[PDB]
């Protein structure tokens, strides 16, 4: 089965809810051992994986310190990293604060780079292959509004996905990204609660629905598998048609 | 509950006698789809591979020199996966490029791709059935290349149709996506691999440091044809060793 | 030493009787180029505008229903700027889209654009002369739209040719670039502006909050035809009010 | 003349050398008053503009403090901003330091956002129109190698160009970017000195030459002018054909 992840061991950040939860569940169903990284205990995610017969555990980590994972990989045996943890801050750009800039950059971009660096340093030292899946955004391609640090960060994530593939593809680490469309999770709750903005989003989705977190799992399994061994530096949009429209 | 399984599905793969089409047909059959191998000549080698793997496949002889050749191929036929892989390329200095080398490439790579997809979707839409289309694009859907103006124009056109048709049919349950292969080993690329200077220049621009294999394209075609990709619509997935990143 | 001046240059603008082609012809002439206004019918309104501004222009009658119609238009004619603006669009559900609506759009928008550019460049390359090509692309070189499959495929194809021809001819001093207009006020877009719901939906997706003017496209065509853009090759410049950013 | 900048007043950052110098010279030749912002006196740039008969002056500012321009716009009358100041740090990504991350992000991305914010806050308060031209990069589109903070930053600059156009286009501030190709300046000196890397770059440029700083000036005049009033959120590559190839 070229889509099996048996024998792999994944770290999924932001794994307690939303996309990270669905990805952790999907990787475990595909056969990976999954460590569910989160800043609070991923009780529900672990319950779901346990009920499904999968193999998972927790890691508590807080990327407000963007170097928080510096020692997480040494002798730990990870060979899939899903960089899903992320935050957003919404304000008019003319009054956007330094705090809302820095805190978003720290989690979404800086912590993504240094966590990936520590993961790859271990693989490269051990002479092993592995996979990185970054969670990008439609705001890696378009600008959106009122989220300057988020759009800048998510564009940056696409940039790092390309550069790190350029440097590491020949060393056996595939680095790719998924760009989800508009998915119903805590990240988008404020948009969904705004009737006008919600309608404007919905009518720009050719599939005619908001995504569900489970819609992102299949691409994460794929990009972590041998069926994607020649995929490097790609940004795959899983968006109901948004970028086509 | 295997989201990559194609059990119960029925695929038509064009250009299925060789190269990427052969590998895609073999991969779809191994994932559980019944596969009809569309080709100009009997795709016996492809059918033999599938039969040895225990899969279910048959041939359809079709020649896209008539770009409307598939107009009646889908009525009551049960297809719900279409892979538009047949394609050709013609090389000459653009200042001298002939009308024939323009027209013949457009006919197979772009016009036939549209009209074959139209007939496939007509049948699904008429019956309320879901389905999947996977178009084979190229790096030359994104970059220009040289000396192949009808091929670059056609492969850019394929990316455009992938987006428009997704835009029009996503809500009707027809996923339309594309794979853009990079440099993959097939019989048609042996001449590039045999030219030492050209091969070196190609490899220097591939981060992975190797040509792809046809099975790498087959894996992506199974993914985009499966429930694992149900919310993927209008996407162009590059399977390229890093080429476009570099 | 005005890098935007086109004094001494000679341009052919297709579709020059109306809309964007008319504005581009007027803008190039105001920048100092001699302009030949190519059109199916006498471009008298365009010529009158240019004559009142004190510019130098004349007509060429040409019909791209024959996509090779310009094959002999450039020999010894002195053109060193070409703007490929002529284009049409046909709308129908993609599942019903006709071969005629496919072919006629491809012929004008893509095949004629290639062969007209080929003839223009043949003359420059044969003589060692520098020159400029500006292709008129579309938002539908980037996104899909709906119900216009031959137009989206053709305009994606135009972006591809812009890249390939730049790739092949940049070192010979022929700059090949494109402008992708967004939603611009011309006679051909009056029906969209007249449909209140369609117009509202368009405006909601334009950050600038307005339709563009044909003169906005003319300004970009003068820039890309000038020494101010000498290192710009293979670019597709969107002039779109913010559409693609949004 | 739709390309004239008479009556406009521009701030050009990084104006002492390289692309910023050429842009400042080009804007002044088009008729703008140009303030040449730099961390050291832009003696040569001012001499060139003076010889050409243009109107220019200096502003000393150091974006190692990314908020350094917070008070630069109040009652100053700027209505063109060219965000050109930028740095690069080259190292293998597996050993890339936090310092080389943060310092590049500070100048190339964070300072770009907050300088633009202060410029726009003044325009919007005064009810005036204006123009922003950001200097992006080929590494806003591709990954490159060994420059993770630079690629992430320059992707981020493209993202901000789109988002700020989305928010401000209707308020009369055009925000666009130029993505130069490989141009001979101090930024690329280390590449040009490496014979192998230099050759690999050159042979990927269809025009057959490295750019010169003067090749970037015309696009900056254009994007600052009335001839570009409907151009918003665009990233114009001025690259000798690189992205086509
Ligand atoms: N439409 C969408 O939903 C959408 C679209 C595109 C991309 N994304 C991206 O998808 C990813 C997942 O977001 P989501 O939609 O699932 O929304 P979410 O519920 O906000 O998920 C964010 C996850 O990141 C974790 N996280 C945030 N800050 C952290 C920190 N300092 N340390 C450790 N973990 C931290 C969150 O933990 P807590 O639960 O404790 O807050 C949560 O697990 C994010 O990168 C987001 O940008 C979402
Ligand atoms: N391999 C690569 O690196 C690469 C890169 C990017 C994209 N592509 C694209 O991927 C697709 C497959 O490439 P490949 O390398 O496998 O090429 P290939 O070996 O040349 O095979 C092309 C296939 O198309 C069929 N075909 C051509 N003209 C036809 C016609 N008039 N009617 C019916 N079938 C026709 C061929 O049939 P016959 O055998 O009878 O001629 C053959 O099966 C093509 O669209 C190609 O452009 C390939
Ligand atoms: N306006 C927009 O918002 C918009 C947006 C994106 C791209 N575009 C593109 O910009 C270009 C100009 O658009 P427009 O709005 O000005 O359109 P238009 O008013 O429809 O004008 C099209 C021009 O093309 C000429 N043309 C059509 N078929 C021809 C043929 N067989 N032979 C010779 N000339 C022919 C037309 O001549 P006749 O007058 O004799 O028919 C006319 O001059 C087109 O390529 C269009 O697709 C426009
Ligand atoms: N191929 C290329 O040359 C290329 C390609 C794409 C984009 N770019 C971008 O073009 C822009 C200009 O670079 P360049 O090629 O002209 O090279 P450069 O000589 O390195 O120019 C950078 C300019 O930014 C200034 N700067 C750097 N740090 C600063 C700080 N902390 N405070 C104030 N000013 C600071 C520099 O001042 P000093 O002179 O005092 O160091 C110099 O004026 C940069 O954003 C660069 O990323 C260059």
DSSP string of chain C?
--TT--TT-EEEESSTTSHHHHHHHHHHHHTT-EEEEEESS--HHHHHHHHHTT--EEEEE--TTSTTTTTTSSTTT---EEEE---------GGG--HHHHHHHHIIIIIHHHHHHHHHHHHHHHHT--EEEEEE--GGGTS--SS-HHHHHHHHHHHHHHHHHHHHHGGGTEEEEEEEE-SB-SGGGHHHHTSHHHHHHHHHT-TTSS-B-HHHHHHHHHHHTSGGGTT--S-EEEESTTGGG-
Pairing mode, strands B10-13 and B131-136: unpaired
**Chain pair A-D, CB pairs under 8 angstroms:** 131
| Interface contact B144-C154, CB threshold 8 A | no
Q: CB contact, 8 Å: D245 with chain C?
A: yes
CA-to-CA distance for D181 and D187, rounded, in angstroms? 12
The answer, for C197 touching chain A at a CB cutoff of 8 Å, is no
Q: Do D143 and B204 touch (CB under 8 A)?
A: no
Tell me whether residues B160 and C167 touch, CB distance under 8 A.
Answer: no
Residue C220 Cα, gap to closest chain D Cα (Å): 7
Q: Which residue of C has its CA nearest to B103?
A: C111
Cα-flanking dihedrals φ and ψ of residue A111, to 5°?
A: -65, -35
C237 and D232 within 8 Å at the Cβ level: the answer is: no
Helix (H) or strand (E) holding B12: strand B10-13
C59 and C36 in contact (C-beta within 8 Å)?
yes
Angle between the A148-168 and A98-105 helix axes, to the nearest 10 degrees?
30
Indicate which atom in ligand 2 lies nearest the CA of residue B140: 6
- ∠ at Cα D41 (D38, D45), nearest 5°? 80
Position in ligand 4 atom list of the atom nearest CA D184: 3
Give, for D57, the enclosing helix (H) or strand (E): strand D55-60
Rounded Cα gap, residues A172 and A229, in angstroms = 9
Residues 6+ apart with CB under 8 A from B37: B13, B16, B17, B21, B22, B25, B43, B46, B47, B50, B57, B58, B59, B60
Do the Cβ atoms of C192 and C164 come closer than 8 Å? no
Burial (Cβ within 10 Å: 0-12, 13-18, ≥19) of residue C147 = middle
d(CA A227, CA A245): 29
Decide if C140 and B160 are in contact by the 8 Å CB cutoff: yes
Which residues in chain B have Cβ-Cβ distances shorter than 8 Å to C94?
Answer: 118, 121, 164-165, 168-169
Residues paired with residue A152 on neighbouring β-strands, in sequence order: none
Domains of chain D: 1-245 (3.40.50.720)
D245 close to B (CB below 8 A): yes
Strand ranges (E), chain A? 9-12, 33-38, 55-60, 80-83, 130-135, 173-180, 235-238
CA A136 to chain centre: 7
CA D91 to chain centre: 24
CA D171 to chain centre: 22
Chain A residues with beta carbon closer than 8 angstroms to that of C246: 142-143
For chain D, say whether A139 makes contact (Cβ under 8 Å): yes
Which chain A residues have a beta carbon less than 8 Å from that of C245? 142-143
Q: Which ligand is nearest to the CA of C104?
A: 3
C231 is a catalytic site residue: no
Contact A45, A15 (CB under 8 A): yes
Unique residue bearing structure tokens 């001819």: C169
Question: What count of Cα atoms within 13 Å lies in the side-chain half-sphere of residue D8?
Answer: 28
H or E element at residue B49: helix B44-52
> Any chain B CB within 8 A of the CB of C111?
yes
Written in H, E and C, the secondary structure of B175-211 is EEEEEEECCECCHHHHHHHCCHHHHHHHHHCCCCCCC
Give the residue among D100, D113, D200, D84 at the shortest CA–CA distance from D150.
Answer: D100
Find the angle CA(B140)-CA(B144)-CA(B150) to the nearest 5 degrees: 75
Structure token pair of residue C205: 């997706």
Q: How far apart are CA A116 and CA A168, in angstroms?
A: 12
Q: What is the DSSP letter of D190?
A: H
Size of chain B in residues: 246
CA-closest candidate to residue C82, choices C129, C30, C12 = C12
Chains that touch B (3 or more CB pairs under 8 A): A, C, D
Q: Please state whether C17 falls in left (phi above 0), alpha (psi between -120 and 50) or beta.
A: alpha
Torsion of CA D54, D60, D63, D65, to 10 degrees: -150
Question: Which tokens hold the place of A138?
Answer: 């439609």
Phi and psi at residue C150, to the nearest 5°: -70, -30
């Amino acid at each position: 089965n070229p889509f099996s992840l048996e024998g792999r061991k994944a770290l999924v950040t932001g794994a307690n809810t939303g996309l990270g939860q669905a990805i952790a569940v999907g990787l475990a169903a595909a056969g990976a051992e999954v460590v569910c990284a989160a800043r609070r205990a991923p009780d529900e995610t672990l319950d779901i994986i346990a009920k499904d017969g999968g193999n998972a555990s927790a890691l508590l980590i807080d990327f407000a310190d963007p170097l928080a994972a510096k020692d997480s990989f040494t002798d730990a045996g990870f060979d899939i990293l899903v960089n899903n943890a992320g935050i957003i801050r919404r304000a008019d750009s003319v009054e956007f604060s330094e705090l809302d800039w820095d805190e978003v950059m720290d989690v979404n971009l800086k912590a993504l780079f240094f966590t990936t660096q520590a993961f790859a340093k271990e693989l490269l030292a051990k002479g092993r292959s592995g996979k990185v899946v970054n969670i990008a955004s439609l705001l890696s391609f378009q600008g959106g509004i009122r989220v300057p640090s988020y759009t800048a960060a998510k564009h940056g994530v696409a940039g790092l996905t390309k550069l790190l593939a350029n440097e590491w593809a020949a060393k056996g680490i595939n680095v790719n990204a998924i760009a989800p469309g508009y998915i119903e999770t805590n990240n988008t709750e404020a948009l969904r609660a705004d009737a006008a903005r919600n309608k404007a989003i919905l009518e720009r989705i050719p599939a005619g629905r908001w995504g569900h977190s489970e819609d992102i799992a299949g691409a994460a399994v794929f990009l972590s598998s041998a069926a994607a061994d020649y995929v490097h530096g790609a940004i795959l949009n899983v968006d109901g048609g948004w970028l086509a429209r």
